Design a protein around this motif. Sequence first.
Motif, short mmCIF file in Angstrom:
data_model
loop_
_atom_site.label_atom_id
_atom_site.label_comp_id
_atom_site.label_asym_id
_atom_site.label_seq_id
_atom_site.Cartn_x
_atom_site.Cartn_y
_atom_site.Cartn_z
N UNK A 123 -41.44 -27.46 55.15
CA UNK A 123 -41.95 -26.18 56.32
C UNK A 123 -40.23 -24.75 56.25
N UNK A 124 -41.22 -24.17 56.53
CA UNK A 124 -40.70 -22.59 56.34
C UNK A 124 -39.85 -22.28 58.18
N UNK A 125 -39.57 -20.70 57.54
CA UNK A 125 -38.43 -20.20 59.21
C UNK A 125 -39.28 -20.78 60.14
N UNK A 135 -40.78 -15.67 52.72
CA UNK A 135 -41.33 -16.89 53.53
C UNK A 135 -42.68 -17.22 53.99
N UNK A 136 -42.94 -18.78 53.93
CA UNK A 136 -44.42 -18.69 54.20
C UNK A 136 -45.01 -18.73 53.29
N UNK A 137 -45.30 -17.59 51.61
CA UNK A 137 -45.72 -17.72 51.02
C UNK A 137 -45.40 -18.56 49.96
N UNK A 138 -44.26 -18.46 49.95
CA UNK A 138 -43.37 -19.77 49.05
C UNK A 138 -43.54 -18.30 47.83
N UNK A 139 -43.61 -19.01 46.55
CA UNK A 139 -43.88 -17.57 44.99
C UNK A 139 -44.71 -17.91 45.23
N UNK A 140 -44.50 -15.75 44.77
CA UNK A 140 -45.49 -14.73 44.74
C UNK A 140 -45.73 -14.76 43.43
N UNK A 141 -47.06 -14.79 43.25
CA UNK A 141 -47.70 -14.52 42.17
C UNK A 141 -48.18 -13.21 41.18
N UNK A 142 -47.86 -13.73 39.72
CA UNK A 142 -47.75 -12.59 39.11
C UNK A 142 -48.51 -11.74 38.93
N UNK A 143 -49.89 -12.13 39.08
CA UNK A 143 -50.73 -10.33 39.54
C UNK A 143 -50.63 -10.59 41.07
N UNK A 194 -44.88 -22.74 64.43
CA UNK A 194 -46.25 -23.29 63.58
C UNK A 194 -46.25 -24.25 62.92
N UNK A 195 -44.76 -24.98 62.12
CA UNK A 195 -44.32 -25.96 61.61
C UNK A 195 -45.75 -27.20 61.82
N UNK A 196 -45.06 -27.69 61.03
CA UNK A 196 -46.66 -29.45 60.88
C UNK A 196 -46.53 -29.81 62.24
N UNK A 197 -46.95 -30.25 62.77
CA UNK A 197 -46.94 -31.22 64.55
C UNK A 197 -46.22 -32.31 64.13
N UNK A 198 -45.96 -32.81 63.95
CA UNK A 198 -45.51 -34.16 63.14
C UNK A 198 -43.73 -33.22 63.46
N UNK A 199 -43.40 -32.87 62.09
CA UNK A 199 -42.27 -32.19 62.17
C UNK A 199 -41.06 -31.06 63.25
N UNK A 246 -50.18 -20.45 67.59
CA UNK A 246 -50.51 -21.02 66.35
C UNK A 246 -52.19 -20.16 65.76
N UNK A 247 -52.24 -19.60 64.57
CA UNK A 247 -52.63 -18.52 64.14
C UNK A 247 -52.39 -17.48 63.62
N UNK A 248 -53.83 -16.84 63.87
CA UNK A 248 -53.76 -15.41 63.76
C UNK A 248 -53.66 -14.07 65.31
N UNK A 249 -52.41 -13.15 65.60
CA UNK A 249 -52.86 -12.49 66.62
C UNK A 249 -52.56 -11.17 66.09
N UNK A 250 -54.12 -10.33 67.12
CA UNK A 250 -54.56 -9.36 65.78
C UNK A 250 -54.73 -8.43 67.17
#
Lengths: 644, 643, 649
Positions: C621-623, C160-168, C628-633, C304-308
Motif C-alpha cells: 500500500x501507499x499514502x 507515491x502510487x506509481x512506485x518506481x519511475x521508468x527510464x523512458x 482507496x487501499x485494498x479493501x482487506x487492508x 475510488x477511481x478518477x474524479x474529473x
Amino acid sequence: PAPGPDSLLALAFPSDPQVSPDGKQVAFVLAQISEEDPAKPDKDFARPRYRSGLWLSEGGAARPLTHAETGRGDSAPRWSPDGQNLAFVRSAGEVKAALMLLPLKGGEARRVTHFKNGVSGPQWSPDGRFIAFTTTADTEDKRDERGEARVLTRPVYRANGADWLPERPAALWLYDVEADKLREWYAPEIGIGALSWWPDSRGVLIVQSEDEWQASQWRQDVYDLPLPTAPQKLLDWNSAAHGLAPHPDGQRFALIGRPAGKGNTEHAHLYLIENGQHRRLDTGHDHPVGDAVGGDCHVGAFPEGPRWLDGDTLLFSSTVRGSVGLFTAHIGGGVKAYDHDPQGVISAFTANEHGVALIRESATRFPEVELNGQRVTDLHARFPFPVREPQRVTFETELGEGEGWVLLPEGEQKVPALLNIHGGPHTDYGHGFTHEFQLMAARGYGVCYSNPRGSVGYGQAWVDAIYGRWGTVDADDLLNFFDRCLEAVPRLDAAKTAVMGGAYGGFMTNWITGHTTRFQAAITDRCISNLISFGGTSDIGLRFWDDELGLDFSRRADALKLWDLSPLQYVENVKTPTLIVHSVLDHRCPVEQAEQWYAALHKHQVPVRFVRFPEENHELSRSGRPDRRLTRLNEYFAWLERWL
Amino acid sequence: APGPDSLLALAFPSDPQVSPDGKQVAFVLAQISEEDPAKPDKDFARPRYRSGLWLSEGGAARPLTHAETGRGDSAPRWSPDGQNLAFVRSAGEVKAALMLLPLKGGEARRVTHFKNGVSGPQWSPDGRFIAFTTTADTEDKRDERGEARVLTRPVYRANGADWLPERPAALWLYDVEADKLREWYAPEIGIGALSWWPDSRGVLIVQSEDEWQASQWRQDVYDLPLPTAPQKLLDWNSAAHGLAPHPDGQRFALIGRPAGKGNTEHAHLYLIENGQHRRLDTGHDHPVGDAVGGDCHVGAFPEGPRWLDGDTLLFSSTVRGSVGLFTAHIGGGVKAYDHDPQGVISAFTANEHGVALIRESATRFPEVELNGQRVTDLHARFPFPVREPQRVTFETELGEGEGWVLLPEGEQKVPALLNIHGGPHTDYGHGFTHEFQLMAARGYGVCYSNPRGSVGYGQAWVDAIYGRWGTVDADDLLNFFDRCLEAVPRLDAAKTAVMGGAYGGFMTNWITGHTTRFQAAITDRCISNLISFGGTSDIGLRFWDDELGLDFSRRADALKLWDLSPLQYVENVKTPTLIVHSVLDHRCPVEQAEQWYAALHKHQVPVRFVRFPEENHELSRSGRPDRRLTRLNEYFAWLERWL
Amino acid sequence: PAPGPDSLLALAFPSDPQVSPDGKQVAFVLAQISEEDPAKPDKDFARPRYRSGLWLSEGGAARPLTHAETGRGDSAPRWSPDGQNLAFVRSAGEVKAALMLLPLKGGEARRVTHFKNGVSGPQWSPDGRFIAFTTTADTEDKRDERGEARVLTRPVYRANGADWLPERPAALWLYDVEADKLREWYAPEIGIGALSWWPDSRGVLIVQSEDEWQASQWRQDVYDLPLPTADAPAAPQKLLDWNSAAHGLAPHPDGQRFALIGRPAGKGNTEHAHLYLIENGQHRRLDTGHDHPVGDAVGGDCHVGAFPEGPRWLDGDTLLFSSTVRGSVGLFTAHIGGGVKAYDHDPQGVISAFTANEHGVALIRESATRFPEVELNGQRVTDLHARFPFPVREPQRVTFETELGEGEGWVLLPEGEQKVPALLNIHGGPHTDYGHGFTHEFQLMAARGYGVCYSNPRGSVGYGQAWVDAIYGRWGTVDADDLLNFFDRCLEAVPRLDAAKTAVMGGAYGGFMTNWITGHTTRFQAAITDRCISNLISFGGTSDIGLRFWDDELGLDFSRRADALKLWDLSPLQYVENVKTPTLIVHSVLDHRCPVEQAEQWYAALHKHQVPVRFVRFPEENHELSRSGRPDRRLTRLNEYFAWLERWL
C-alpha cells in the motif's frame, strides 16, 4: 482375512547382480515401493512407485550405497576394473538417466554426463581407460508437444516398452576416464544391439542390421569398431545375434542366437566365431540359452551375458523343463552342468575367473541375491503371507509325457479350479516365483498351470509340434492337462472352472472359449483375437507369423489361413463370461485385438468387462506401475468372485 | 501458384439464425488467428479458429462480438421478443458459458457457471425459459491420474467427442424472469433432438431405450413437460431427428426412417399424429438434408424443418449433387421453394416472417443470405481465381451417371486425379471445395463423380452397391475416369492418381489392389479390413449390418467381410501410396491405416504415412488449421514426386 | 450489535461522471467489492477486491453497460463526439489496461490497442477523428525480476502510487478512428502532465517541465503539439513560459486562448490554485474576487477511481469550475468580463467530480451525511446511499477564536446520553479542509460510541489565503494552538464528551501533528499516528516531494546547514522524550509521500522510552490506503484503530 493384491506393496525387487572384478563383492539394484512424493501424498489417491537404490555385499547381509528419496532411482551398477569405483545411472525427475561415478572407499558420486536425454548401457573397458554408453544426447522432438503430425516411412516405428522410435538412433559415446572427457564414438544409421569390449580394450564388437527392413526381419550381423583416433563387418550372420562374449584370446568370440534360415522358433544357442566362420558351441544340449521361465517378481535388468571362465569354458544360463540353470560350454567338449537345481530359476548372473553373483528363486522362494553361493539378501522374509507348494500332474502326448502343476489352497473343501495358460508360446511355467499364483491359492483357488507342446524347456521337437497350427495340439494338451488335474485332485470343483492367460495365453483363452463352453469364467489378458490385424499393428507383426506359422498376412492365400487361425472367427460360439485386460501402449499385442473381442462379445450379449490401462504396455503384470498392478489383480479376483 | 496456406485467408460462416420478426440474421463467423496473439512462438505458427457473432438487418453484416482468445462465440439464439441474443462463449478455462446479449446496447452477461460449460441452448417460444444441456461440474480424473477405464457398455467412444462419460449431459432450464437455473431431466442414455412445443409447455426429445438400442440406431420420441419424467410419444424404434412441432401444438414432424430396411434408406419427412406416422415428402425420391461434399463448413449448420404455415413444412434435400429448399404440404407432395440444381444450401432457419440461409456452389464460397439478399462478402476473401468444372457422363444398367472435371488454366497436358467421395451415400457436385480449386490452381485436372452408391440419384442408385462394395461402384469410378480421359484431351493418361477419404479410402485401397493403372495413390482416413472395423469403429456394431447385411461377429458373415476387405488383395498393389490418418478418428480407426502401411512395406511398395495426433475423421473439413495445411502439403508433395 | 469495519464491504463506489455530448446521458464507473476469484475463494483467507464496470443513465436509474467478472474492471469512459460510441479502458489480468471501443446502440466492445503495458488517459478529439492516449507500449524492464541493480541519476526516481519511475516516460499516441490505425505521436524526454485538445482538433496543448530538476521543483510550461503530417511527427512548440505549476488546461472555444489551473511563478505550493486566462504569453487571473482554491480539497474516504474536475467553457464568456469553500466544494463560473458567480454551491455539500458542455452537466455529490451519488442535470441517477449499512448521524458545529477570526470544527456524537470518549481527529495537508465530505471512518467511530471532534485550524485551505499563510514556516505553533483550543471548546460545549477518555489521531500532516502534540502535552489517553512525519530532515531526502515541500511550506532547504537546524527544531522527534501517551503507528511500506522510515524512528524512540507502542506495517500500500487501499487492508487499518481505542479508552 485372506491376503489381497496389495500384498505386492510389501515386496522389494532385486536386479542386476554385478560381481566385483576380484570376485569378493556384489553390487546390485533393489527397487522398493514408495509414494511418488513421500512428503506430499495425495489424500484421495495413493501413488505407489518403484524407487531403486544400489546395494553392496562382501558376503554378509547387503547394505545400501545410495539413498534415493525422489525419482525412479539408481540402476546399472558397473565396477571399475580396479575395484575402486562404481559407475551407475541415476534417474531423478529432470535428471533422466545421468552417468554417475561413485568412489567405493568414501565420498559421494559425481555426475559425469550432462545430456538432456540421459544415457544407456554403460560398460567399462577391461583396462579401465574408458566407459562406453549410448545416448540421444540433447536431441529434442517437439512434434507431440506441439500437436504436429508424425511422418512414418520406416517399417517399424514403435516398440513395446519404448513407445515411439526416434528418427536418429542413440549414438555410441566414449568417456575417457584419464582425461575426464566425453566424445561421440559412432552414430549408427540403423541402431546398435549387443555390444562387448574386446579383452585388450582395443574397441568393441557390435550387432547391427544392414537397413530398416532387414532389422524388421530379425537379420543382424556383427561388426568390429576400434577406438577412435567406422565399423567393419566381422561376421556375415544375417540372423538373430546378441550376448557377444569375446574370447580371452582377443580374436574369437561367442554369440547367442540362431543361424540364418532358422526362424524365431529355433532355440537360441551358442556359436563360436573364428575368422568369419561359426560352429555350434553348446553341443549336446537341446535347450535354449537364457531364462524363459515365467514369474512376476522381476523388476529391472537381469544380465545373462555368457562369460569365459578360462580359455575353454563359457558359462551360460539355460532353460530346462521349467527351471533355469547355469551350465558351461566347452570348445573341447560338450555341455556340463555348473549350477542347476531342477526346481529353481537363476534369472541373472555375472561372473569372472574369481567369482560369481546371481539371483535365484523357485516356485516357493522369492528372488534372492547370492555371491559365490552365499545369499546376501533377506527378501523372501518380506513376503507377507505363507507360500504353498505345487503338486505335479502329467498328461500324455504322442511325443511323450507333458507336465504341469496344481497349487492348492489350505483346507480340504471343494475349491474352484483355474486353468492358467502361459504366453510365448515358447516359454515355460515351472519354477519361477509367481506372486499372482501364490495369491490365487491364498484366496481359495486351485491354480492349474502346465507346459503344453509349444513350450520351450522340453527340447526343440516339443516347440516345433505347434508350428503352423496353433489351436490344435496345444489346445488339446491344455484341456487334457486340465482334465487330468480334475481327475487327480478331487477337491477341484469341476462345476466352478475358469480359463485365463496372457498374450499367446490370451489367444488361447479366446480360442478355447470359442471352441468349448465348459468354463464358467474366462479372463483374457493382453490377448490376440485377429491374426491378420496383428500382422499389421504389432511391433513384431512383420515377422512373427512368418516364423511361427509360415504365414505372411500381406499375401492372400496366407491371410486366409491366418483368419482360420484367428479366435475371432469362432467367437459366435463363446458363451463364457469374459474379463478382458489390456493396456493402451501394449505394442506387442495392440489394443485393437481386445477391442474386437469386446465388441464381438457385446454383439452376442455375452457378459463382458474390459479393463483398459493407459500408459502401460505388454509388461504390466510383470513390471507395471504398482497401482495398476494392484488394479489388474483386483479385477481378476472380482470377476472370479462373481462367476465362481 | 497458391498453396495450402491459402486456407488461412478464409473466414467460415455458420449457424444463420433469422430473427423472429424475419428482418434480421445473426450468424457465426470463424476467422483464423494465432492461438495467443500476444505471445506467438517464433519457431512455430499456431493458426486457430476464433469465432464471433455477426448481425445484419439486410445490409453488410457487422460484428457483434470480438473474441481475441479461445475458440470464441457460437450458437446465437434470438429471444422471442427480438431484444436479446443468447449464445455460448469459449475463452480458455471458460469452456462454454451461456451468455445473454442485449441487442439495443450494452455487453453480454454470463448466465451459467459450470466447470464443463453447456451446449444446445433453445429459447422457449414464450421467452420464459432457455433449455440447454450440461455435464455441470462433473469431474473425471482417471486419465489425469493414470487410472484404468473399466468398460462395460457397447459404445464407449464417439468420433469428435473421444470418450463418452458415465453420465450423459443433463437437460437444464434457465428461468429468464427469475434469473435462476435448475436441472430439468437427467437422462440415463442421452438426449438427441429436442424441440419446444409451440405453447412452451415442455419439449419433445429423441432418446434410445438403453445402450444396446442406441448402438443399433433405434430411438423413440418422448414428451417432457416443464417441471412442477418423460412419456413415450412415438414407438419409432428407428432413426429420428429434426423435430418440428406443428403450430397446432399436438402434431409434429420428424426426419428419419421407419423401422425396416435400415439406414441405407433415404431419410424422409414424417408427420406424427397420435402415435401414427405418415410420410410428408411424397413423390420426391431424394433424402432430407445436405449430403453434398465440401470443405468450407466450420461450425453448426442447422437444417431443422420449419412450418411456414399450418399446411407447409420447409425442408432441405439433396438432389443430384445439389441441396435445395423444398416445401412439403399436409395436403400433398413436395414443391421447390429455393432450389438451384447447380448450388448447395447448407443451412437455413425460418419462421412465418423470413428465412436466412447459407448458400454456395462449386465456384462460390459460402455466403449468408437473409430473405434472398446476401449479407456477407466472403467469396471476395478467396485468395486465388476459382475455375468452373465441366460435366462428364457415364452409362450404367440403371441409367446415366455423372461427374465433373476441374481443369487448370492454360492449354498444356495436366495430370489427372481421380477423387472419390466418401459415405458412400453422399454426392459430389455443387459444394465448394477449396481442396479441388487448389489442386487445379497447382496444375492438376480433378476428376470427381457420383458412382452407384451415391445418394442424390434416387433409392435404387443407393441400393445398387448393397452388400457388394467393390463391384459396380468400382466399375462406375473407372468407367467415369476412362470417359474423362476420352472427353478431356488435356488430361494426361500417363500421369494419373487415385485418392479418396473414408469410403473413398476403402475404394482407393480396393482399386489399387485390383489395377496398377495409377501412378500414385492417396488413401485418407481409410478402411482396409472390414472385420477389424466392425470391432473398433464407433459405428462398427451396426454399419456393416446396414450397409452389407453382414455381422462381423458371425463366422459366415466375417468371411464375406474378409472377401470385401481391400487388405485381402493388397498383394497386387504396386502404386506408391500416401496414407493420411488421424489418431482420434473413431469412425475409421487408425488400425485400418496401420494394416495398409505394414502390408505395403511387406511388399516393398513405396509408402508414406502421415499420422495426425488429436484430430479425428473430420480433419479435412474442420481440423486445426495447421494440420489442415500439413495434410494438403503432404498431398501435393506426393503428387509432385510421382506425377 | 454495533457496526464494524466490514461495513465498508457493503458499499459501491462511483467515479468519473461523464456527460454525453448532447447533454442527455451520463456514463460513469462503479466499483463493487467482490472476491478476487469468486469461483475459487480461499477458505482460509478472504480476498475482497475492487471490481468496476461502466454504468449509463438518460435520467432514470442507472444501468450497467459492462459486466466484469474478473480483474480490476473497466474505467475511463469517454464519449465519441457523435454520441454513438464509448471508449474506455479495460483491466483483466494479463490485459493490463486496453483501450476498448463500445457501440452504444448494440454489440460488444472491440479492443483497439494491443500493448504489453496498456494505455492511460484516452481523450477523443472534438471532431471525433482521433483518440489521444499515452502508453509505455511494449517496453520491458527486467531489472527487478532478475535482481539487477537500479542505477539512479535523476533527482526524483519514485512517486507515491506509481512506485518506481521508468527510464523512458510514457509516449503520446494517436488512434486514427477512420483509418483504424495507431501511431506514436510524441515521445517526451521528461513526461507529459495535463493534455487538452484544441476545439478545432488541430492538435493538443500539453504541460511539460524543461528537465528533471525543474520538474522536481514544480516548474512546468505549456507546449503546442499539432497533429503529425509525416513519418516523423513535428515536435511540440513551447507556448507559454509559465515556469510554475499548471494543470487543467481548458482551451477557449475561439481556438486561440486557453485557461489553466495553477499558480504563477513566485508563489509556492501554499498559494491557492486559481484560474488564469492565457492569451499570447500574457496571463491574468480569471477567478477574481474569489479567495478560494480551484478543485476539491475536502476530506472524505468514499472516493475510488478518477474524479474529473477540468474546467469547461459553457460559452465564450463563461468557465465552469469547482472550488473549495469552508469545508464545502461548489461549482462556480468565472467570466472573462466579470467576477465569479455561484453555479451550484451547497455550503453543506461537496461536488467531487463533474463534466459539462453547453447542453448538460453530470457530477458526483456528497455531504457529511450523504454517501456519493451520481447526478445528471440535477437528477440523481444512483441509489448508493441506500447501501450504507448503518444509520448516519449529523455533526454539530463548534467554533474557536483566533487572531484572524473564528475557526470552526464539528463534533459527531453517538446515540444516547451517556459520557463518551472524545477523539480529536486532525486532517492532513495541511492545506485541505474537513467539513462536508462523506467520511465512513467518522460515521463508524460514532456508531461505535465515540464522539468525533474534527476541525479546520489555521493552515486549512477553505478560509482564504491568509488562513493558509498563518502557519508558514512555523508548523507546531498556531496550528497546534487552534487544534487544542478547538478540542477544549468541544469538551466545554458538549458535556457528555468525557475529558478523562480522550485520544488524538491524524494522518500525514495530521500524523506530524499527532506526534507534535503528544511530544508537547500528556493530556491524551491514547494516540494514533498514521502515515506520519517525525523527522523533517530525513523527509527532505526520502519523500517523493522532499526536494521542494519544505522549501515551499517552511522556506527551508534541508541540504543547507542553517535551514536543517530549523527543520530539526520543527521535527516532532526532537521532543519525543516527553511522549507518555500509548501510541498506535499506522504506515504503509510503499508510501513514498511520507516514507516509512518516518514511522520507524517514532516507533524506535517510543521503545527507547518504554512507552506502550504498536506499529501496523502494511505491505504494497501507499499514502492513499485509507481512501482507496485494498479493501482487506482498509478493514485491518480500521480494526487496529478500534482495538487501540478499546484498550486505552
